Design a protein around this ligand. Structure first.
Ligand code: HEM
Lengths: 359, 433
């Protein structure tokens, strides 16, 4: 059952490739009977069907509560708003790549470039007081010490209650400003803090993971690294190809079937939880090619729970990847590829442990 | 007329002693690799001072009375020395600048010393007098300096939610719920009565060294085992062991160690602010008769519960009430202190000035009044089982040398291993040569 997260490096491990040969939807009895959705069309079905089920945490919410919170937050990612945010993100990307260059090579790209960049973009998008960003990261990070995590939770909730009061009086820009503007007392400080914390934490983890592993992925295809510098209009396609190839969100939470459904010839009884492997559906048809048009992938999910931050993620990844490849043509890894350590299969996102880069 | 606190009162007095005695300061040295915007660093330093009134607070007065004079951000910004150096001479410069005394009557209680090494590498030292900053304030200092620098390096004023409480509010709160000192059966009166019944060079240097102290998991497990057996913690197990060692070394039937507690974690408003929030707790244990380690573990456990039920009276005020002839060369009530910490995230790993590769520069042990400060890490497996006890015996140089401290550390490790493997051992039949 751990096979869904076994990888070579960025590539599918052999055991997972043998499993995907066994059709795009397999049943597996353990203890209970689980299901693996491994195909693009099969994963779309099990996510787009109304026959499955799973504060401020949209991903663990279900209708009608999921609808109530998704409605208030969704217009924050509008096409016009993301376009208005581009020059700010571009300046943020340029600054971090200035720090990267001035500090000089080598650089630990993940914690010194990618992480700070993702969190700075996420905080400008949220409308967080721009210099309380470090404090909100620190108070909501998952660094252990359960008493400390509870105390940090108490301190962050107190800050958010003061910020929500300030915002509900006279709001401002950012997702938090709009949610406080269009909705007052319709959303609580708890839900406001939950939405904000999901953005600057797990969403930042995925963004920084795409930035780091995406950089490595471009580095290991140098002709496409140069091609993106040569034809920067390929950025949108390159990002769609990168997120498809990386699949940092490898597997999804189980979609327990509320009815007895037959996606294919195999019957799924009510209660047989089906696990979506976006990594398999994206990588089992395949090579990296940023010139591909109309990328066919499920890297941002599907159905009512499809990624709410995909507009910002795509936007930020395009600006970062295209700016990076043109600013560092001689960019390379500072260590041999074998020394590149990847997170052990832990079911919660896929990422590098670190990315030593030089130029 | 803004009052000071009991701790500030004691810190102010001990600050008038001179260069020979190392200043009682907290300090942090940061290695900053990259292009540093010196004028932004100066602005960010002033911004931290503007954010925390106590960092721009001055302490004029005399032996009978000290006052908190809060300056504005500009007049009262911290001084910033720029001292070009080579790595060669950084150890001596950091020690000297960290020890330079403060004139708290006409100076803000912190300062910064920048040491340019190259155009892309500097070392920054921040010193703050303990009248204004405790151990936890150093983390707050660096984090707020990082937040202010990131904004200043972009030609912008720091945009942060201000402090809900200032330390002036804490000083008045202490002057309030404490004013009932002379009133039968009052809250603090009950506590003042509790501690009464419960309880060398003429000029100190306060220089501290440290020797390592390691206990293998085997003996660590047996102490945790005996601690659980008596309803105590690992702190209680080491407290009892240390109380036996000091009892035999000094030949005394009544040993009193202390422990430093941080700011009140319940009062959540104190979380993001700089201040002398260190609370000290005496833990007097009576070893009368000839108690066994299990029995001493009980006495240690019982005094820790009663003491934590009586921690609203500040240690410095209690000192004034039970010390007849106070000494600047021997710490009041206790001279040995014990810290037992569970493993946790290190704040130094998460210090980052935007635009600069930030990493901490080690400094010598902090100046202290204690003779011995045993700081131990209580390592555990994911299940909570003992996984070694690792730490340092911080010793006063005016009182021990490295050999005398190593002999002490080894003597305690032996005692720890003995009482763990035989918790019924009496105080008299314990092995301390
Ligand atoms: C700024 C960046 C991002 C933000 C703000 C963001 C936000 C969110 C939110 C709020 C949800 C839950 C929506 C709901 O349940 O209705 C979600 C789900 C999801 N996100 Fe993102 N996200 C970001 C980046 C990414 C990236 C880079 C990936 C790469 C794989 C990703 C993959 C997913 C997936 C697959 C889901 C659906 C999970 C499931 O259905 O079980 N997201 N995202």
């Amino acid at each position: 059952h751990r096979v869904l997260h076994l990888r070579d490096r960025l590539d599918l491990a052999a055991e997972l490739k043998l499993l995907c040969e066994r059709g795009p939807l397999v049943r597996i009895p353990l203890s209970a009977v689980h299901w693996f959705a491994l195909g693009y069309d099969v994963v779309r079905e099990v996510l787009g069907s109304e026959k499955f089920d799973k504060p401020g945490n949209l991903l663990q919410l279900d209708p009608p509560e999921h609808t109530r919170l998704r409605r208030m937050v969704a217009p924050a990612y509008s096409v016009r708003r993301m376009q208005a945010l581009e020059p700010r993100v571009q300046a943020i990307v340029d600054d971090h790549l200035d720090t990267m260059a001035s500090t000089g090579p080598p650089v630990e790209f993940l914690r010194e470039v990618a992480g700070p960049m993702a969190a700075r973009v996420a905080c400008e998008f949220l409308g967080i007081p721009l210099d309380d960003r470090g404090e909100l990261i620190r108070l909501t990070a998952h660094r252990g010490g359960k008493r400390r995590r509870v105390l940090n939770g108490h301190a962050y909730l107190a800050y958010m209650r003061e910020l929500a009061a300030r915002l509900r009086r006279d709001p401002g820009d950012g997702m938090l400003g709009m949610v406080a503007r269009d909705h007052g007392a319709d959303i609580s400080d708890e839900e406001l803090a939950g939405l904000c914390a999901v953005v600057m934490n797990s969403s930042v983890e995925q963004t920084e993971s795409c930035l780091a592993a995406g950089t490595l992925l471009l580095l290991e295809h140098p002709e496409q690294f140069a091609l993106l510098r040569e034809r920067p209009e390929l950025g949108e396609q390159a990002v769609e190809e990168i997120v498809r190839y990386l699949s940092v969100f490898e597997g999804l939470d189980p979609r327990t079937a509320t009815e007895d459904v037959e996606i294919g010839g195999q019957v799924i009884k009510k209660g047989e939880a089906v696990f979506c492997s976006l990594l398999a559906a994206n990588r089992a048809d395949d090579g990296f090619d940023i010139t591909r048009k109309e990328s066919r992938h499920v890297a941002f999910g599907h159905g009512i729970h499809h990624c709410l931050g995909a507009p910002l993620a795509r936007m930020e990844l395009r600006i970062a990847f295209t700016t990076l490849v043109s600013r560092f043509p001689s960019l390379r890894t500072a260590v041999p590829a074998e020394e590149i350590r990847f997170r052990p299969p832990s079911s919660n996102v896929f990422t590098l442990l670190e990315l030593p880069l030089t130029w | 007329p803004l009052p000071v606190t009991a701790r500030q009162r004691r810190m102010w007095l001990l600050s008038r002693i001179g260069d020979e005695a190392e200043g009682l300061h907290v300090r942090v040295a940061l290695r900053l690799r990259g292009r540093l915007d010196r004028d932004a660093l100066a602005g960010a330093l002033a911004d931290v001072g503007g954010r925390h009134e106590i960092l721009r607070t001055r302490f004029p007065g005399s032996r009978r009375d000290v006052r908190q004079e809060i300056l504005d951000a500009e007049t009262g910004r911290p001084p910033l020395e720029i001292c070009p150096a080579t790595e060669d001479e950084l150890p001596g410069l950091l020690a000297d600048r960290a020890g330079r005394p403060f004139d708290l009557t006409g100076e803000v209680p912190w300062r910064a010393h920048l040491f340019p090494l190259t155009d892309r590498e500097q070392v920054l030292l921040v010193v703050a007098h303990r009248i204004a900053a405790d151990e936890e304030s150093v983390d707050v200092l660096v984090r707020d300096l990082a937040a202010a620098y990131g904004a200043r390096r972009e030609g912008r004023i720091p945009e942060r939610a201000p402090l809900a409480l200032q330390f002036a509010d804490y000083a008045l709160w202490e002057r309030e719920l404490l004013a009932g000192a002379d009133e039968r059966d009052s809250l603090i009166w009950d506590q003042i009565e509790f501690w009464r019944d419960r309880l060398r060079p003429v000029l100190p240097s306060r220089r501290a060294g440290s020797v390592p102290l390691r206990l293998p998991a085997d003996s660590h497990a047996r102490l945790l085992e005996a601690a659980r057996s008596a309803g105590g913690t690992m702190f209680t197990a080491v407290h009892a062991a240390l109380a036996m060692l000091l009892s035999r070394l000094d030949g005394r039937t009544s040993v009193t160690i202390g422990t430093r507690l941080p700011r009140d974690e319940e009062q959540t408003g104190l979380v993001p602010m700089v201040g002398p929030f260190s609370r000290w707790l005496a833990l007097p244990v009576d070893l009368s008769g000839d108690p066994a380690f299990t029995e001493i573990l009980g006495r240690a456990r019982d005094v820790s519960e009663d003491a934590h039920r009586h921690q609203d009276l500040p240690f410095e005020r209690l000192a004034e009430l039970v010390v007849p002839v106070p000494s600047i060369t021997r710490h009041p009530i206790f001279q040995v202190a014990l810290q037992l910490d569970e493993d946790d995230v290190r704040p130094e790993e998460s210090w980052a000035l935007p635009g600069l590769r930030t990493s901490p520069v080690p400094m010598p042990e902090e100046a202290m009044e204690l003779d011995l400060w045993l700081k131990l890490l209580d390592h555990r497996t994911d299940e909570g089982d003992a996984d070694g006890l690792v730490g340092s015996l911080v010793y006063a140089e005016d009182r021990f040398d490295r050999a005398g401290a190593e002999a002490l550390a080894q003597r305690l490790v032996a005692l720890l291993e003995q009482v763990g493997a035989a918790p019924e051992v009496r105080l008299s039949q314990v092995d301390v040569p």
